[PDB]
Design a protein around this motif. Structure first.
Motif, mmCIF file in Angstrom:
data_model
loop_
_atom_site.group_PDB
_atom_site.id
_atom_site.type_symbol
_atom_site.label_atom_id
_atom_site.label_comp_id
_atom_site.label_asym_id
_atom_site.label_seq_id
_atom_site.Cartn_x
_atom_site.Cartn_y
_atom_site.Cartn_z
ATOM 1 N N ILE C 40 -0.330 4.892 5.892
ATOM 2 C CA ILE C 40 -0.057 3.447 5.896
ATOM 3 C C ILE C 40 1.296 3.089 6.478
ATOM 4 O O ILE C 40 2.250 2.868 5.737
ATOM 5 C CB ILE C 40 -0.163 2.886 4.511
ATOM 6 N N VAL C 41 1.364 3.001 7.802
ATOM 7 C CA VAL C 41 2.618 2.746 8.505
ATOM 8 C C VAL C 41 3.040 1.278 8.428
ATOM 9 O O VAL C 41 2.290 0.394 8.817
ATOM 10 C CB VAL C 41 2.508 3.196 9.954
ATOM 11 N N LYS C 42 4.243 1.031 7.916
ATOM 12 C CA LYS C 42 4.807 -0.320 7.790
ATOM 13 C C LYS C 42 4.138 -1.198 6.706
ATOM 14 O O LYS C 42 2.916 -1.215 6.576
ATOM 15 C CB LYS C 42 4.833 -1.024 9.153
ATOM 16 N N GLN C 43 4.953 -1.898 5.912
ATOM 17 C CA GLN C 43 4.463 -2.926 4.989
ATOM 18 C C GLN C 43 4.931 -4.316 5.451
ATOM 19 O O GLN C 43 6.124 -4.530 5.687
ATOM 20 C CB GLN C 43 4.923 -2.642 3.578
ATOM 21 N N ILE C 44 3.992 -5.255 5.585
ATOM 22 C CA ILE C 44 4.270 -6.547 6.223
ATOM 23 C C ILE C 44 4.868 -7.553 5.264
ATOM 24 O O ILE C 44 4.878 -7.330 4.058
ATOM 25 C CB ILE C 44 3.019 -7.111 6.845
ATOM 26 N N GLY C 51 4.591 -11.045 -1.564
ATOM 27 C CA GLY C 51 4.145 -9.700 -1.912
ATOM 28 C C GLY C 51 3.607 -8.984 -0.680
ATOM 29 O O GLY C 51 2.569 -9.353 -0.126
ATOM 30 N N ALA C 52 4.311 -7.952 -0.246
ATOM 31 C CA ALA C 52 3.967 -7.338 1.027
ATOM 32 C C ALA C 52 2.495 -6.912 1.171
ATOM 33 O O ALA C 52 1.958 -6.191 0.331
ATOM 34 C CB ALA C 52 4.893 -6.173 1.316
ATOM 35 N N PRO C 53 1.851 -7.374 2.242
ATOM 36 C CA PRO C 53 0.591 -6.794 2.690
ATOM 37 C C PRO C 53 0.964 -5.691 3.643
ATOM 38 O O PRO C 53 1.757 -5.931 4.548
ATOM 39 C CB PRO C 53 -0.224 -7.815 3.418
ATOM 40 N N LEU C 54 0.409 -4.492 3.464
ATOM 41 C CA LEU C 54 0.791 -3.371 4.334
ATOM 42 C C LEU C 54 -0.350 -2.641 5.094
ATOM 43 O O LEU C 54 -1.309 -2.144 4.476
ATOM 44 C CB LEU C 54 1.664 -2.389 3.581
ATOM 45 N N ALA C 55 -0.187 -2.562 6.429
ATOM 46 C CA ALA C 55 -1.213 -2.126 7.395
ATOM 47 C C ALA C 55 -1.341 -0.607 7.535
ATOM 48 O O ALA C 55 -0.377 0.072 7.828
ATOM 49 C CB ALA C 55 -0.938 -2.767 8.758
ATOM 50 N N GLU C 63 -6.996 -0.973 9.599
ATOM 51 C CA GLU C 63 -7.145 -2.085 8.657
ATOM 52 C C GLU C 63 -5.839 -2.387 7.906
ATOM 53 O O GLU C 63 -4.945 -1.542 7.841
ATOM 54 C CB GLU C 63 -8.307 -1.825 7.680
ATOM 55 N N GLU C 64 -5.738 -3.592 7.344
ATOM 56 C CA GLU C 64 -4.495 -4.064 6.728
ATOM 57 C C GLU C 64 -4.666 -4.637 5.304
ATOM 58 O O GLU C 64 -4.916 -5.827 5.128
ATOM 59 C CB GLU C 64 -3.828 -5.085 7.643
ATOM 60 N N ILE C 65 -4.502 -3.784 4.295
ATOM 61 C CA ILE C 65 -4.704 -4.159 2.900
ATOM 62 C C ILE C 65 -3.497 -4.914 2.319
ATOM 63 O O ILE C 65 -2.425 -4.929 2.927
ATOM 64 C CB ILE C 65 -4.999 -2.900 2.080
ATOM 65 N N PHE C 66 -3.685 -5.561 1.161
ATOM 66 C CA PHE C 66 -2.566 -5.966 0.290
ATOM 67 C C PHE C 66 -2.195 -4.733 -0.535
ATOM 68 O O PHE C 66 -3.095 -4.049 -1.041
ATOM 69 C CB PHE C 66 -2.966 -7.109 -0.623
ATOM 70 N N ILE C 67 -0.897 -4.427 -0.666
ATOM 71 C CA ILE C 67 -0.496 -3.099 -1.161
ATOM 72 C C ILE C 67 0.269 -3.110 -2.465
ATOM 73 O O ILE C 67 1.343 -3.684 -2.556
ATOM 74 C CB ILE C 67 0.276 -2.363 -0.120
ATOM 75 N N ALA C 68 -0.311 -2.460 -3.468
ATOM 76 C CA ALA C 68 0.271 -2.375 -4.797
ATOM 77 C C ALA C 68 1.687 -1.807 -4.686
ATOM 78 O O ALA C 68 2.001 -1.133 -3.700
ATOM 79 C CB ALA C 68 -0.604 -1.503 -5.692
ATOM 80 N N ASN C 69 2.536 -2.092 -5.680
ATOM 81 C CA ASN C 69 3.958 -1.715 -5.637
ATOM 82 C C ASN C 69 4.118 -0.228 -5.414
ATOM 83 O O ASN C 69 4.668 0.485 -6.254
ATOM 84 C CB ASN C 69 4.701 -2.163 -6.905
ATOM 85 N N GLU C 70 3.628 0.219 -4.262
ATOM 86 C CA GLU C 70 3.646 1.617 -3.889
ATOM 87 C C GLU C 70 3.496 1.939 -2.409
ATOM 88 O O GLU C 70 2.422 2.307 -1.935
ATOM 89 N N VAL C 72 5.139 4.386 0.572
ATOM 90 C CA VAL C 72 6.046 5.396 1.094
ATOM 91 C C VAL C 72 6.015 5.312 2.611
ATOM 92 O O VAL C 72 5.927 6.331 3.295
ATOM 93 C CB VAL C 72 5.635 6.782 0.623
ATOM 94 N N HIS C 73 6.094 4.079 3.114
ATOM 95 C CA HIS C 73 5.910 3.765 4.528
ATOM 96 C C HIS C 73 5.279 4.942 5.245
ATOM 97 O O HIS C 73 5.788 5.439 6.238
ATOM 98 C CB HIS C 73 7.218 3.349 5.185
ATOM 99 N N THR C 74 4.140 5.362 4.725
ATOM 100 C CA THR C 74 3.432 6.514 5.221
ATOM 101 C C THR C 74 2.686 7.050 4.028
ATOM 102 O O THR C 74 1.996 8.049 4.134
ATOM 103 N N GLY C 75 2.816 6.350 2.897
ATOM 104 C CA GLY C 75 2.328 6.800 1.580
ATOM 105 C C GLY C 75 0.924 7.391 1.546
ATOM 106 O O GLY C 75 0.123 7.196 2.463
ATOM 107 N N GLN C 76 0.643 8.107 0.460
ATOM 108 C CA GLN C 76 -0.593 8.864 0.317
ATOM 109 C C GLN C 76 -1.798 7.969 0.135
ATOM 110 O O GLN C 76 -2.526 8.111 -0.845
ATOM 111 C CB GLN C 76 -0.484 9.845 -0.837
ATOM 112 N N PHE C 77 -2.025 7.056 1.075
ATOM 113 C CA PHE C 77 -3.142 6.123 0.913
ATOM 114 C C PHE C 77 -4.469 6.754 1.299
ATOM 115 O O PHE C 77 -5.223 6.190 2.070
ATOM 116 C CB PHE C 77 -2.914 4.827 1.662
ATOM 117 N N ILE C 78 -4.743 7.937 0.765
ATOM 118 C CA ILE C 78 -6.068 8.515 0.881
ATOM 119 C C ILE C 78 -6.950 7.778 -0.121
ATOM 120 O O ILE C 78 -6.603 7.706 -1.300
ATOM 121 C CB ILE C 78 -6.023 10.010 0.573
ATOM 122 N N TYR C 79 -8.065 7.205 0.335
ATOM 123 C CA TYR C 79 -8.994 6.550 -0.597
ATOM 124 C C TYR C 79 -10.484 6.723 -0.264
ATOM 125 O O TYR C 79 -10.834 7.197 0.815
ATOM 126 C CB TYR C 79 -8.649 5.094 -0.737
ATOM 127 N N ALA C 80 -11.349 6.344 -1.206
ATOM 128 C CA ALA C 80 -12.792 6.429 -1.026
ATOM 129 C C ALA C 80 -13.506 7.255 -2.090
ATOM 130 O O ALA C 80 -13.372 8.477 -2.112
#
Lengths: 213, 95, 234
Positions: C40-44, C51-55, C63-70, C72-80
């Motif tokens: 997840i590069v960059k939080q908008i 409240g930052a939406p981060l792409a 895709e560009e989600i709204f991002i919980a207080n977490e 790591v401008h690269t954070g472990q956003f593995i999901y599914a």
RNA sequence: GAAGACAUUGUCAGGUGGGGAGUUUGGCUGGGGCGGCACAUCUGUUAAACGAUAACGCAGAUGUCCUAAGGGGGGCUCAUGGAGAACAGAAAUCUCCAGUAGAACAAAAGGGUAAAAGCCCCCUUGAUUUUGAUUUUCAGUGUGAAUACAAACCAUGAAAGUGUGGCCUAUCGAUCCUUUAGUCCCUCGGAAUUUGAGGCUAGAGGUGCCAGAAAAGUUACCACAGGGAUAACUGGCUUGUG
RNA sequence: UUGACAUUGUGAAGAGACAUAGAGGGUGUAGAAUAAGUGGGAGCUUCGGCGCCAGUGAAAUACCACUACCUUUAUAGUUUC
RNA sequence: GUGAUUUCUGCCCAGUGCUCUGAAUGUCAAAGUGAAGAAAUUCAACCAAGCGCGGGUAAACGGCGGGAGUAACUAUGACU
RNA sequence: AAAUAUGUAAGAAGUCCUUGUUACUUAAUUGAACGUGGACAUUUGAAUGAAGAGCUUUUAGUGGGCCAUUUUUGGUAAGC
């Protein structure tokens, strides 16, 4: 049902019994009806015998009271009490006004009310079984209690009630049912329109039923 | 104001004439609903909206209708004859 | 009487957000059943929705989600679905724990997740028990609902803390509150608005005059005041 | 994937609904208003000795009450002295006797009324059916009221009579509609039969603004046509009040 | 906003329709005694039980028809809640 | 709705509004049902909401009484 | 109990005489109402006046009035 069968309630119904021959003692028949079913007040009766002809059959304590002088208006006979210190507390309501005006016959007292009778004393009692009727209340409640004890005729007031008679054991037919009608007058009809105002009734003598309608 | 049920008010009919005691009640009312021409035509509005008719009706009464005395013999066999006493309030025979 | 405000807007009229001044949009994406990656590069910083939406991710070929207080401008956003639980990730709430708390979360499965997308407000999954297939979810609201088994899920408190724990000191800053959404500010303390104007109804010595509850079901115009309520004072 | 005869959509019915539409808000009045009714009535007067006659003139009555407070014949005669007093003894109420109409006639006021028109008894239901004519605005308008007849049908008296409502002068209501009482009479129009609808003549149901619309406010944000016919201000009389 | 009727048709648990009434039967003060209770009743039946002419009370009954509570009890096709 | 802070939110739910599962029961329309005539038609019973009954509600509209006595010169009220 | 004003009547179709009609009520030669035949009118208080008199239709304007003398209502009074 005011039809041929009247003499089926009378003639054909005059020796039914429930055993053998027909006994050996006197008889006892009549012709049931009512009084007017109005409300024992406004309008339901007047004057004129049928007859009919009878009296009590069982008890006669009816209604007559008002003042301390209304007791003796029920002493040499037997009636109910309206009390003195009760028309301002409890001489009428439901089971109260009843008490004094709720017996079997009707009422034969006098009058004295004033501004109280639209929902208490004189009121709550009418169709119950009394509400100031015509019992020549002036000398007392005995002479006019010829219209409240015996003879009769058949003073029909309060709640239903009346009488009838013609013969004894067996000797009536067209005039047996037509004797039952004869045993009806200012109770079967009257002035302006009154040839009928009910639905049904009953009758017999002692045998079994009368009209099977 | 104390009338007396039936009283020989001469009268006739005829096919009778002379006097004759008449059982005399006062007159009542009578429903109409769905027969009256009054209705036959007065069913309208005209019709997606309405109002009523010029006389309907809030005026100012008199606080005293009238006795529709309805004398009627029985021998004359007919016919329930109406009369008109005017004075209210009151009531039949006391007296 | 004119057409009182409220009645007034709604329709195109002259009011409708910044529908061409922001970043992307919500979007928990589309729906596969066993975990995909998300760098997840960059939080908008957008507008409106503080409240930052981060792409993020873009994996199946870039895709560009709204991002919980977490972030790591690269954070472990593995999901599914089958996916290690964590601040971030996003697993079908039909396979969570019991006391977790997803942020974005979808009423009904798929259909990108909006329930408690707002700044901060998270949606503690408190329940899970009674479940042939569903879930006993909390909600930012304050009431409870049984969402439906496998349905997205943020997995962590929405970002942007006390976006307004305070304190908008000055009439400005409303310099924003707008340059955001509609022209909601200022707001004309109605009961000055004259008789014909809005429903209020000034009248002589001021006066909100008669009533103020306002039966639910009145004529969109008889409306306004205190909607239709079950109370009053503090 | 969710929803699964549901909901929705449509047609009527009922709630609801100043958000919206339309619509109305008496009069006479020392100017409008609040008020009062000289808006319908009656007596006395004002009113000038036939009649007529004004005010927001003076003094008063009317939106009922009476089965008898109607109808006829009898009898009788109504608010002082002097006598007889036991709860009475100023008397309240009782009985004797000898003279101004001072009483009484529902109710306002005036008229009237004494073997009565008052009071006690006796007997009835004329407070009746059909009409018509009359009288009541100086009256040509309908209304209410009232007068004398005709024809019937009764009351009452021995009669002659009298009685067509309360002694007279006040006490009431068009037009469609509805209800009823009337012959059992007239038609539904291709004929019938009943059911129903419609008609004719006599009434009840309301119009009081009483010659008879069915009707809430506010405007100081306002508007129009006219009013010295109509009020604030000048002048004007008058001068109580100063 | 609420109802009905159309849109609206697959199946499955339980009423009511076809095509039913009978028995103990009366917890204020008083009469030896059963009161939401009616009256026809001088009689019902080869006995006399109760009466009744006596009857008090808030209201009198065996020959009992009834304006009205509780307990107590049968479905095979369509139908329909 | 009220208007920085600061302090401070008294008592009234009967009235009008609002609003809740609530009330053992009374109205309450259309279709649907029953009864009666030869039908037209006219009587019936049940009947959603609503109403009325019950509750909460005033940082909802708004409300917030009145007269008698009543010692230690005198007037006096915490008194009743 | 006036004055003023206000009803009527008047010379005259009128009396006077004779009888005749039936629904009327009188017991009727009782009358009533009506009509025939018959005597006298220009007429001997009334006056004074007539540009005849009667009659039918129609259809304008008007309906806000104001003065005086006497007689009066209100009102201190009023060019009220």
């Amino acid at each position: 049902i005011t039809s041929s069968q009247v003499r089926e309630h009378v003639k054909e119904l005059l020796k039914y019994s429930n055993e053998t021959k027909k006994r050996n003692f006197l008889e006892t028949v009549e012709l049931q009806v009512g009084l007017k079913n109005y409300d024992p007040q406004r309008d339901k009766r007047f004057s004129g015998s049928l007859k009919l002809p009878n009296c009590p059959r069982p008890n006669m304590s009816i209604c007559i009271f008002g003042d301390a002088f209304d007791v003796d208006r029920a002493k040499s006979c037997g009636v109910d009490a309206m009390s003195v210190d009760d028309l301002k507390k409890l001489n009428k309501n439901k089971k109260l006004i009843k008490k004094l005006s709720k017996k079997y016959n009707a009422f034969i007292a006098s009058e004295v009310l004033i501004k109280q009778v639209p929902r208490l004393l004189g009121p709550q009692l009418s169709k119950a079984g009394k509400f100031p009727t015509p019992v020549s209340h002036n000398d007392d409640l005995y002479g006019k209690v010829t219209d409240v004890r015996s003879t009769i005729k058949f003073q029909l007031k309060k709640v239903l009630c009346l009488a009838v008679a013609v013969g004894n054991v067996e000797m009536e037919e067209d005039v047996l049912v037509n004797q039952i009608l004869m045993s009806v007058n200012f109770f079967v009809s009257l002035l302006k329109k009154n040839w009928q105002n009910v639905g049904s009734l009953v009758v017999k003598s002692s045998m079994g039923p009368a009209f099977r309608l | 104001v104390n009338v007396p049920k039936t009283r020989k008010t001469y009268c006739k009919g005829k096919t009778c004439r002379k006097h004759t005691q008449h059982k005399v009640t006062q007159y009542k009312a009578g429903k109409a609903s769905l027969f009256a021409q009054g209705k036959r035509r007065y069913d309208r509005k005209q019709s997606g909206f309405g109002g009523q008719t010029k006389p309907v009706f809030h005026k100012k009464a008199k606080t005293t209708k009238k006795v529709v005395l309805r004398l009627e013999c029985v021998k004359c066999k007919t016919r329930a004859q109406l009369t008109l006493k005017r004075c209210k309030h009151f009531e039949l025979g006391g007296e | 009487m004119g057409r009182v405000i409220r009645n007034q807007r709604k329709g195109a009229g002259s009011i409708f957000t910044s529908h061409t001044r922001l970043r992307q949009g919500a979007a928990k994406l589309r729906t596969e059943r066993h975990g995909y990656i998300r760098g997840i590069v960059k939080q908008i910083v957008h507008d409106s929705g503080r409240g930052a939406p981060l792409a993020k991710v873009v994996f199946r070929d870039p895709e560009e989600i709204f991002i919980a207080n977490e972030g790591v401008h690269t954070g472990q956003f593995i999901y599914a679905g089958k996916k290690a639980s964590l601040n971030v990730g996003n697993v079908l709430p039909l396979g969570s724990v019991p006391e977790g708390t997803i942020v974005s979360n979808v009423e009904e499965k798929p259909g990108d997740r909006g329930a408690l997308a707002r700044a901060s407000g998270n949606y503690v999954i408190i329940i899970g028990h009674n479940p042939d297939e569903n879930k006993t979810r909390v909600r930012l609201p304050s009431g409870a609902k049984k969402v439906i088994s496998s349905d997205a899920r943020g997995v962590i408190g929405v970002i942007a803390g006390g976006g307004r724990v305070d304190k908008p000191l000055l009439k400005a800053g409303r310099a924003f509150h707008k340059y955001r959404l509609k022209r909601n500010s200022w707001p004309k303390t109605r009961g000055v608005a004259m008789n014909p104007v809005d429903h209020p109804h000034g009248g002589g010595n001021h006066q909100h005059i008669g009533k103020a509850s306002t039966i639910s079901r009145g004529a969109v115009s008889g409306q306004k005041a205190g909607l239709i309520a079950a109370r009053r004072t503090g």
